[PDB]
Every structure is written in C-alpha cells, then in structure tokens.
C-alpha cells in the first residue's frame, strides 16, 4: 500500500546518493569534515547554517515542505551539537492539525474495536453455550434445528476468523522498527501468507453467513408458501447454497485479484470492482430477504384480523414478531446499504460504520439468546432434565 513504495523511494534515494558520491571527487581542502548521513545527503561548501538543503523526497508528504529551506551547521555534520547520534533542531515537520486528527481517529478506532470485541466475545460465549446445550441430546433434532445449528456454526466461524485476523494484525503491527533487517523481513514475503489466509477465511465466513441468512429466508418462504408439508427433507440445495455457493464467489475474487494486483495483505481494497464482486452475494441476500419479510408480515396481518378480533392487542403481537424477526433475517441493514461506501463524507461514513458494527456485532448474541431461551421447546426440554437430576 504505502510501506513498500516508501521503501522503494528510500532505496532510490540511497543509491542515487551513492551515485552522486561516486561522481563527486573527494575534496582536497576543507574547513569542516564531510561524512555520510542516512537521513539526507547534502555535500556542500563549509558554512555555518548558511547552505540551503531541500527536504528529502522519500516521504509520504513531500510537496508540503518542498518550499521550505532547512539550515544545518556543518568538523563532522552533527558534531555541532557535540553528539554523534544527536540531530539538529530544524527538520521537515508535519502539519500541526494532522497529528491531532490522526490521534482522534485512532481513539475512535480503538473505541470501536474494543466495543465490537466485547460484542463478539459475548456472542461467541452465547453461541458456544447454545451449541453445547442443543444438539447433544437427540430429542428435538429436526431439519429446522439442523439449519439453525448450521447458521450458528457459520456465525461462530465468522467470529473466530475475525478474532484470529485481529490478533494476527495486532501482533504483526505491534512491533516497532529498530533495524534495517527487521523492516526488510517485515515487508518481505513469507510472513504475509497468514494474513492472506486469514483475510480469505474471514471473507468466506462472512459470505457463508449471508448465504445462510438467504437459506433461512428461502426456507421460511417455502414453509409459509405451501399448503401441505414437504414430502422429504431437502438438505442438498440448502447446503449447496450455504457452503458451495460462497466458494463459487470468494475463490474467483482471490484468484483474479492476486493475479491482477497483489497486496501485502488482502484486507485492503483499492479497486472497487473486486469489492463489488464480493458485495454481489451480499446485495442479493438482502433484497430477497426483505421481500420475504414483507410477505411474512402481510400474512401475519391477514391472519391476526380474520379469526381473532384485534381489540388493540394485535399491535403488541405485531411489534413482538417484528422484533424477533428482524435480527434473524438481517433486514435492518437495508437502510444503510442504500448508499455505497464510496460516496460518503467522513462524519457520515464514521457514523454509518459505527451503526453497522453495533448492529452486526450483537447479531449472533441476539439470535442465539432469542432462539435458545425464548424458544419454548428448549426451555421445556431443560426442565425435564433438571427434574431428572433432582430426582436422583
């Protein structure tokens, strides 16, 4: 992204400095000595804070300081402050508000990261508790509970991949730079394979989660779209959409994007086409699920007015159904998905990211808590086992 071009510019500065030193013959008579300096190469006449030196060009910012001249005292160059590793007082500094705005966005990112870390930790705890207490007794294991367990496993895999890539990124970028060999082996290949596989794993897990949400919506529509029960279990196509379809989309992105523009870590999108390829399964798992949700709400409204009179009590049932149906189908992100992330100002983009992370981070916890404790079957099964334990 930036570090590799920075290293290339630094190497270009270094070998043009070597070329200039080779071209320039050594001086015969001098007042103050000349030595090589890593930061800047300024072989000039002996003068005390009089010679003009331009700012180095191997910096992320170069045009903002190219109009400012720095004056440095010339025996040895930095011998003026009477120190071999000491440095002069005048440098090519960065703008004043830049450090403040970077600190502010860093604090915002840290707060967002700890917030969704707590959210994912609670969600993973609830999901593992639900997976431990469901499916291990062989009493209510049916097609619907099997699909729910598959969705919970996909959520667990996505959360684990996110945590793994977060930990790997933190451990990789936590170490500072103290030697040329350290940064050279940091930017070299071999240590980025873990980053690449973590990125492709988290993308595959998120796409699998979206595909499983689409599978849940399709199953709900199929159940409330037929007068009679299904003839037989139909796991094949649901498993194909939930598992086979995600690798039909994620793998071409990895193959083409690495072939076209290789990045040091794959979690950095520069071309919007590659991002839209992965967004296409996401945008076809929301527009159909919203239609399914609308049909379900219409059916509920029709069915709660004919047989039973409203008597002002239908509003509470409708609100409860909407509140228990929004997190499962993932229809609450449609308000934020209308506007793309490319066309968004900074405050609006930050707020949209905050709301999206807040809603998606507690999705797994909400759905697990709801469909594990508010479900009547699981809580009714638990009382029987508790009574069996109490009897003994």
């Amino acid at each position: 992204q930036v570090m590799d071009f920075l290293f290339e510019k630094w190497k270009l500065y270094g070998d043009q400095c070597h070329h200039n030193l080779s071209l320039l013959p050594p001086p015969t008579e001098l007042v103050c000595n000349r030595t090589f300096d890593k930061y800047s190469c300024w072989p000039d006449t002996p003068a005390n804070t009089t010679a003009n030196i331009s700012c180095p060009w191997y910096l992320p910012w170069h045009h903002k300081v190219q109009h400012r001249f720095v004056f440095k005292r010339c025996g040895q160059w930095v011998r003026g402050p009477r120190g071999q590793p000491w440095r002069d007082a005048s440098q090519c500094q960065m703008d004043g508000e830049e450090i403040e705005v970077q600190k502010e966005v860093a604090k915002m990112y840290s707060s967002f990261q700890v917030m969704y870390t707590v959210g994912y930790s609670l969600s993973l705890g609830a999901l593992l508790l639900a997976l431990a207490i469901l499916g291990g007794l062989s009493k209510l294991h049916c097609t619907r509970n099997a699909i729910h367990a598959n969705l919970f496993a996909s959520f667990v895999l996505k959360a684990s991949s996110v945590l793994v890539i977060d930990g790997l990124l933190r451990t990789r970028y936590s170490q500072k730079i103290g030697d040329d060999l350290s940064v050279s082996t940091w930017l070299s290949d071999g240590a980025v394979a873990g980053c690449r596989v973590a990125a492709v794993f988290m993308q595959y897990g998120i796409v699998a989660n979206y595909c499983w949400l689409l599978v849940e919506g399709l199953y709900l529509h199929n159940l409330l779209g037929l007068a009679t029960l299904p003839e037989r279990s139909f796991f094949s196509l649901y498993l194909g959409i939930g598992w086979g379809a995600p690798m039909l989309f994620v793998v071409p992105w990895a193959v083409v994007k690495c072939l076209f523009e290789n990045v040091q870590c794959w979690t950095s999108n520069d071309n919007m086409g590659f991002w839209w390829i992965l967004r296409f399964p996401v945008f076809l798992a929301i527009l159909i699920n919203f239609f399914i949700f609308v049909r379900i709400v219409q059916l509920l409204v029709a069915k709660l007015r004919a047989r039973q009179m409203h008597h002002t009590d239908y509003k509470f049932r409708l609100a409860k159904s909407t509140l228990t149906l929004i997190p499962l189908l993932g229809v609450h992100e449609v308000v934020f998905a209308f506007v793309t992330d490319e066309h968004a100002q900074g405050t609006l983009r930050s707020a949209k990211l905050f709301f999206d992370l807040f809603l998606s981070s507690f999705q797994g916890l909400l759905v697990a808590v709801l469909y594990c404790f508010l479900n009547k079957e699981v809580q009714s099964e638990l009382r029987r086992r508790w009574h069996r334990w109490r009897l003994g």
């Binding site: 992204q1 930036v2 570090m3 920075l6 630094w10 890593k38 930061y39 910096l59 992320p60 590793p85 440095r87 440098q91 970077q102 966005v105 860093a106 990112y109 967002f112 990261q113 996110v162 890539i165 990124l169 970028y173 500072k176 730079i177 103290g178 940064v183 988290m202 993308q203 998120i206 870590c265 979690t267 950095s268 999108n269 991002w275 992965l278 967004r279 996401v282 992100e333 992330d341 990211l353 999206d356 992370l357 998606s360």
Partner: peptide, 28 residues
C-alpha cells in the same frame, strides 16, 4: 460490507503509523 471496510481502514491507518515510525527512526 460492514466489517471489511473498517478492517481495511484500520490496516491503512496501521500502515500509515508504521510509515511515520519509519520516518521517526530515520529522524534519530
């Protein structure tokens, strides 16, 4: 999607901070 853009922004900021650390290291 929601998480990918945030992760990319965090990676970009981390790379920028690494570039600033490199600049400071050569500034010593």
């Amino acid at each position: 999607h929601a998480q990918g853009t945030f992760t990319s922004d965090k990676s970009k900021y981390l790379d920028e901070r690494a570039a600033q650390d490199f600049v400071q290291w050569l500034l010593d």
